[PDB]
Amino acid sequence: SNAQEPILTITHQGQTVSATYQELLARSDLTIVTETPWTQGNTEFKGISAQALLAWMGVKQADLKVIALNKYWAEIPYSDIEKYNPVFAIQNNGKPMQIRDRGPIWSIYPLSSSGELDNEILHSRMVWQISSIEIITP
Ligand SMILES: Nc1nc2ncc([C@H](O)[C@H](O)CO)nc2c(=O)[nH]1
Which SUPFAM superfamilies does this UniProt record tie to the protein (predicted)? Predict the structure, then answer.
């Protein structure tokens, strides 16, 4: 693959848009440094924040339905977007993520800085190998 191949589809109001790594990196507004239940120590995760992705799509309040390559899925509620602003990470310590290393996109919450490292609800919303995001409006 390469930085210009599509890796994500976003659906909003019955319309689908595709995005490449190159595109997502150009819109990457947030780095989260955090521990996770599946990694050692602190990791730096850079990508497009949930708030930034909604702004791009022309929405302020919405939930996100996130689906992974392996079919796992989880909905990120607006309340989490407001309170935690999780990042759709495309880099792990500054480099792209191979599918075999939870890539190409992984939703990451600021567990360390929010004191939520043991919060299983937030863990369940940290979806690796993301392939699609659907914006769910009220
Ligand atoms: N793609 C993908 N992402 C995941 N993210 C988090 C967790 C955690 O185990 C959750 O706590 C499970 O609900 N599981 C998964 C998973 O299986 N698949």
Answer: Oxidoreductase molybdopterin-binding domain
